[PDB]
Amino acid sequence: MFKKLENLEKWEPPKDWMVIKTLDTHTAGEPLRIILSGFPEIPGKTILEKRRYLMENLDHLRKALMWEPRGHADMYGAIITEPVSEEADFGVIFMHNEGYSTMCGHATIALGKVAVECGLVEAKEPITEIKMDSPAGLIKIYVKVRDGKVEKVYFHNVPSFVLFKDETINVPGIGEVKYDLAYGGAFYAFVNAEEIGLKCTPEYYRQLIDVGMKIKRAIMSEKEIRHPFEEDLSFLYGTIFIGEPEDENSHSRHVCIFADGEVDRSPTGTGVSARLAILYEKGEIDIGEEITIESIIGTKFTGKVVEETRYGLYRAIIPEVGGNAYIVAKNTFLIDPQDPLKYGFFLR
Amino acid sequence: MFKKLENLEKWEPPKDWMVIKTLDTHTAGEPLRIILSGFPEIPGKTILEKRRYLMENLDHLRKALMWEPRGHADMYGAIITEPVSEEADFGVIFMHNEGYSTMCGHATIALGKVAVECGLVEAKEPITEIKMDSPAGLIKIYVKVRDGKVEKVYFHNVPSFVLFKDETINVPGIGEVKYDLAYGGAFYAFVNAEEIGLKCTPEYYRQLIDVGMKIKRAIMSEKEIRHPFEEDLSFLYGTIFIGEPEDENSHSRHVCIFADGEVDRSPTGTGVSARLAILYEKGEIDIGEEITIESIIGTKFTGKVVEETRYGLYRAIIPEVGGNAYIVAKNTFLIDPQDPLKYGFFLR
Ligand SMILES: O=C(O)[C@H]1NCC[C@@H]1O
Ligand SMILES: O=C(O)[C@H]1NCC[C@@H]1O
């Protein structure tokens, strides 16, 4: 019987079943579902064109993988494509509970870890470089390797800058909220949790979603959020609550509310990128000064300003974010043609 | 490159990595993670003894599979064991966000579907019978089979009975709540959603968790919930909100809040079982009268009173619950010995 049961592991579905193979990771608790097979080729000369193809043709499959029952409200995914730039190893479109997504730091860390750990690139010591065409632009991944093992994954992000500083907005049913709006490969409104009467802790999970989504919708309806070069990137990704650090060597804590009330269990890599831009512009950190930022579950990333730059009319930085990721599953997702919930459903 | 990527499918972890192989289903949207391998043998002469062995020795693995990152707050699992009774095919202990669990109807339907679909038992027409030792006692599974295909999965539950009728309890911050308390292989307090100012709809997800868990904790602190024969079964499993039916042929809608604020996406099989006992005792349904009950996502089970019986000092019924399940994945879960979140974490 126990053999029959184990042998179910070699059960093969009918030939009219859709099969999608994935490698799942967590980065600081935040999942990445890496699609290995079962998607068609994604035409487009740019990553943003590829992202448009996916949004217009393959959003059913995004739901099938990100939504219950195969996923959940807080699941996050990656489609790997051929590079579109001269120097990049691969291209990527991310996905979440609401759609196909722009750049994401926790996912970049996971992709760097698996590239070296699983032997897709040679494990060079002390540093392996991988280049990735993201929807936001070119990302440089630096994997720290010792004795053929990954010690840490860093990336250097696209230019990160402050859009708005020390704004106030009237949030219906909440009141006056003070925010900075910064770009770290995505746009975020940063607010102080304690000033709003919240903590960046599990016991405030529901209130962080509710208040974060109201702040997000209020800023989206009142402010133009313009990427200097790309209409498709010109939108608010989320609200990030800044909280006091739990641990002595931590700078601060992040809770990112993004997509459709999705919550990042990581400190958010694009979030740390945008935060470094704010702290740098305010003269609160210097070039080469490493800080540590926590998540709602006390997981951590490092952040550091690498250098100064310009991006359109903005003063900008190249930020470094550091972390690590672990493989948690190899999944074969199956879609029964008779399944009435084949493309999943959404509760949160 | 795309071959390298696909070949990640056949990446094999180091020998010191834990590997747990599963078959994932949904029943009316509610997941079941069926463990195929990776657990030791579970000693015990009774299912409740086996449940105690798992709770005392293997709760780390329950978290590893039910909790993020490999699971989520609403994930549900099954451990298959050798039968302990003369006539049963197998034994089972269920698991959820809080621990190793007693009997569960959505999971029973999934196990019946898989047993026939995946050829663990002969597909007999029109009915295949499978017997299952649950922690609540012997369960009879009746799979309707036509042309070698499963049309529907029914089970006949353990004797189901009313414990308390038309009680009221003061719930702090909510007020006076009217409830019935019934057993359907688990104990539930039934409350009317609309009378409390809620709807059994996705829009009320958060409020259903909050109010359901306050009702649950209040009833657990105030009322003796005694299974006539087994101390380990003597506790309140959850709160079930009764709502008006969305669809013409539906009787009513269920939302079950159970374990640690977990929400059943199905109508709850033990819930329908306990509800049939209430409606029968109130003279609202007769033997052989089939009703349909909806879930928060509008998925459905059938319920029917099969016959009358006694259980200890109670008037009881044998309830029939009907539904269907679909395979959604074959999973190989991996635990990296260096993963600091190897046994997962809990947010809701
Ligand atoms: O780390 C990040 O940047 C992403 N994590 C999930 C949401 C963010 O895009
Ligand atoms: O259908 C059932 O009985 C189970 N579904 C999840 C919670 C219940 O135990």
DSSP A9-78: GG----TTSEEEEEEEEEETTEEEEEEEESS-----SSHHHHHHHHHHH-HHHHHHHHSBTTS-TT--EE
**Contact across the interface for B5 and A36, Cβ inside 8 Å:** yes
Looking up residue B84, the CATH number of its domain turns out to be 3.10.310.10
Ligand closest to Cα of A109 equals 1
Residue listed under structure tokens 């509710």: A210
List the structure tokens of B316: 């009881």
Q: At what angle do helices A47-57 and A59-66 cross, to 10 degrees?
A: 80
Ligand closest to Cα of A270 equals 1
Check whether residue A43 and residue A140 sit in a common domain. yes
Partners of B118 on chain A (C-beta within 8 Å) are 8, 11
List the structure tokens of B62: 């329950």
Residue B256 CA: which ligand 2 atom is closest? 7
Determine the residue among B35, B203, B331, B342 to mutate to test chain A binding: the one whose Cβ has the most chain A Cβ atoms within 10 Å.
B331
In this complex, is the C-beta atom of B168 within 8 Å of any C-beta atom belonging to chain A?
Answer: no
| Nearest alpha carbon to residue B134 among B156, B161, B109, B102 | B102
In this complex, is the C-beta atom of B40 within 8 Å of any C-beta atom belonging to chain A?
Answer: no
Q: Is the peptide bond before A43 cis (omega within 30 degrees of 0)?
A: no
Pocket-testing residue among B25, B30, B236, B293, ligand 2, by greatest number of atoms within 8 A of Cβ: B30
Q: Is the peptide bond before B13 cis (omega within 30 degrees of 0)?
A: no
Check whether residue B37 and residue B105 sit in a common domain. yes
Q: Rounded to an integer, what distance in angstroms lies between the CA atom of residue A181 and that of residue B288?
A: 63
CA of A48 to the centre of ligand 1 (A): 18
| Nearest alpha carbon to residue B273 among B126, B110, B31, B108 | B108
Chain breaks in chain A following residues, C–N > 2.5 Å = none
Of B69, B299, B332, the CB nearest to A29: B69
Is residue A205 a contact partner of residue A263, using CB atoms and an 8 Å limit?
Answer: yes
Minimum distance, in Å, between the CA of residue A248 and any CA atom of chain B: 19
Q: Are strands B149-156 and B314-323 parallel, antiparallel or unpaired?
A: antiparallel
Determine the residue among A20, A21, A68, A97 to mutate to test chain B binding: the one whose Cβ has the most chain B Cβ atoms within 10 Å.
A68
**Contact across the interface for B327 and A336, Cβ inside 8 Å:** yes
List the structure tokens of A325: 């990721």
Q: Is the peptide bond before A31 cis (omega within 30 degrees of 0)?
A: no
Q: Is the CB of A105 under 6 A from ligand 1?
A: yes
| Nearest alpha carbon to residue B102 among B133, B135, B76, B80 | B135
**Contact across the interface for A31 and B69, Cβ inside 8 Å:** yes
Is residue A99 a contact partner of residue A59, using CB atoms and an 8 Å limit?
Answer: yes
List the structure tokens of B269: 């099989």
Over the range A55-91, which residues count as b (16 or more CB within 10 Å of their CB) and which as e? eeebeebbbbbbbbbbbbbbbbbbbbbebbeeebbbb
CA torsion angle for A55, A61, A66, A69 (degrees, to 10)? 150
Is residue A144 a contact partner of residue A127, using CB atoms and an 8 Å limit?
Answer: yes
Ligand closest to Cα of B32 equals 2
Q: Which residues have C-beta within 8 Å of that of residue A258, sequence separation ≥ 6?
A: A96, A186, A237, A238, A264, A268
Task: Identify the domain containing residue A276 by its residue range.
Answer: 158-323
Of A69, A328, A346, the CB nearest to B333: A328
CA of B153 to the centre of ligand 1 (A): 42
List the structure tokens of A8: 């179910």
Helix segments in chain A, DSSP class H:
2-7, 47-57, 59-66, 105-117, 193-196, 205-222, 269-281
* SS3 of residue A332 by DSSP: strand
Minimum distance, in Å, between the CA of residue B199 and any CA atom of chain A: 14
Check whether residue B268 and residue B281 sit in a common domain. yes
Q: Is the peptide bond before A126 cis (omega within 30 degrees of 0)?
A: yes
Q: At what angle do helices B105-117 and B269-281 cross, to 10 degrees?
A: 120
What amino acid is encoded at B63 in this protein?
Answer: K
Check whether residue A307 and residue A217 sit in a common domain. yes
Q: Is the CB of A30 under 6 A from ligand 1?
A: yes
Check whether residue A197 and residue A96 sit in a common domain. no
What does the DSSP 8-state code read for residue A203?
Answer: G
Q: Rounded to an integer, what distance in angstroms lies between the CA atom of residue A164 and that of residue B99?
A: 47
Q: Is the CB of B27 under 6 A from ligand 2?
A: no
Check whether residue A30 and residue A116 sit in a common domain. yes
What amino acid is encoded at B289 in this protein?
Answer: E
What does the DSSP 8-state code read for residue A104?
Answer: -
What does the DSSP 8-state code read for residue A159?
Answer: P
Is residue A237 a contact partner of residue A190, using CB atoms and an 8 Å limit?
Answer: no
| Nearest alpha carbon to residue B133 among B92, B79, B72, B78 | B92
Of B74, B120, B334, the CB nearest to A330: B334
Residue listed under structure tokens 């807080």: A74
Check whether residue B165 and residue B82 sit in a common domain. no
What does the DSSP 8-state code read for residue A271?
Answer: H
Q: Are strands A30-37 and A77-81 parallel, antiparallel or unpaired?
A: parallel
Q: Rounded to an integer, what distance in angstroms lies between the CA atom of residue B279 and that of residue B337?
A: 52
Check whether residue A201 and residue A89 sit in a common domain. no
Check whether residue A346 and residue A208 sit in a common domain. no
Is residue A262 a contact partner of residue A77, using CB atoms and an 8 Å limit?
Answer: no
Q: What is the 3-state secondary structure (H, E, C) of chain B?
A: CHHHHHHHHHCCCCCCCEEEEEEEEEECCEEEEEEEECCCCCCCCCHHHHHHHHHHHCHHHHHHHHCECCCCCCCCEEEEECCCCCCCCEEEEEECCCCEECCCHHHHHHHHHHHHHCCCCCCCCCEEEEEEEECCEEEEEEEEEECCEEEEEEEECCCEEEEEEEEEEEECCCEEEEEEEEECCCEEEEEEHHHHCCCCCHHHHHHHHHHHHHHHHHHHHHCCCCCCCCHHHCCEEEEEEEECCCCCCCCEEEEEEECCCEECCCCCHHHHHHHHHHHHHCCCCCCCCCEEEECCCCCEEEEEEEEEEEECCEEEEEEEEEECCEEEEEEEEEECCCCCCCCCECCC
Q: Rounded to an integer, what distance in angstroms lies between the CA atom of residue B239 and that of residue B220?
A: 11
Q: Would you please indicate which residues of A are annotated as catalytic (active-site) residues?
A: 104
| Nearest alpha carbon to residue B239 among B201, B277, B202, B210 | B210
Check whether residue B183 and residue B61 sit in a common domain. no
Q: Rounded to an integer, what distance in angstroms lies between the CA atom of residue B139 and that of residue B134?
A: 7
Q: Rounded to an integer, what distance in angstroms lies between the CA atom of residue B86 and that of residue B140?
A: 14
Check whether residue A315 and residue A337 sit in a common domain. no
Residue listed under structure tokens 């996705």: B202
| Nearest alpha carbon to residue B113 among B139, B142, B91, B90 | B142
Give the Cβ contact number of residue A15 at 10 Å: 6
Partners of B31 on chain A (C-beta within 8 Å) are 68-69
Phi–psi pair at A255, nearest 5 degrees: -130, 110
Q: Is the CB of A159 under 6 A from ligand 1?
A: no
**Contact across the interface for B263 and A347, Cβ inside 8 Å:** yes
Give the Cβ contact number of residue A45 at 10 Å: 8
Asked how this structure was determined, the answer is X-ray
In this complex, is the C-beta atom of B203 within 8 Å of any C-beta atom belonging to chain A?
Answer: no
CA dihedral sign of residues A201, A202, A204, A207: positive
Of A24, A36, A346, the CB nearest to B9: A36
Identify whether B118 is a catalytic site residue: no
Q: How many domains would you assign to chain A? A: 2
Q: At what angle do helices A269-281 and A105-117 cross, to 10 degrees?
A: 120
In sequence order, the β-bridge partners of residue B161 are B183
Pocket-testing residue among B258, B263, B294, B301, ligand 2, by greatest number of atoms within 8 A of Cβ: B258
* SS3 of residue A331 by DSSP: strand
In this complex, is the C-beta atom of A24 within 8 Å of any C-beta atom belonging to chain B?
Answer: yes
Q: Rounded to an integer, what distance in angstroms lies between the CA atom of residue B299 and that of residue B302?
A: 11
Check whether residue B309 and residue B173 sit in a common domain. yes
Phi–psi pair at A173, nearest 5 degrees: 80, 5
Residues in chain B: 348
List the structure tokens of A235: 């939108």
Q: Rounded to an integer, what distance in angstroms lies between the CA atom of residue B27 and that of residue A7?
A: 22
Q: Which residues have C-beta within 8 Å of that of residue A308, sequence separation ≥ 6?
A: A287, A315, A316, A317
Residues in chain A: 348
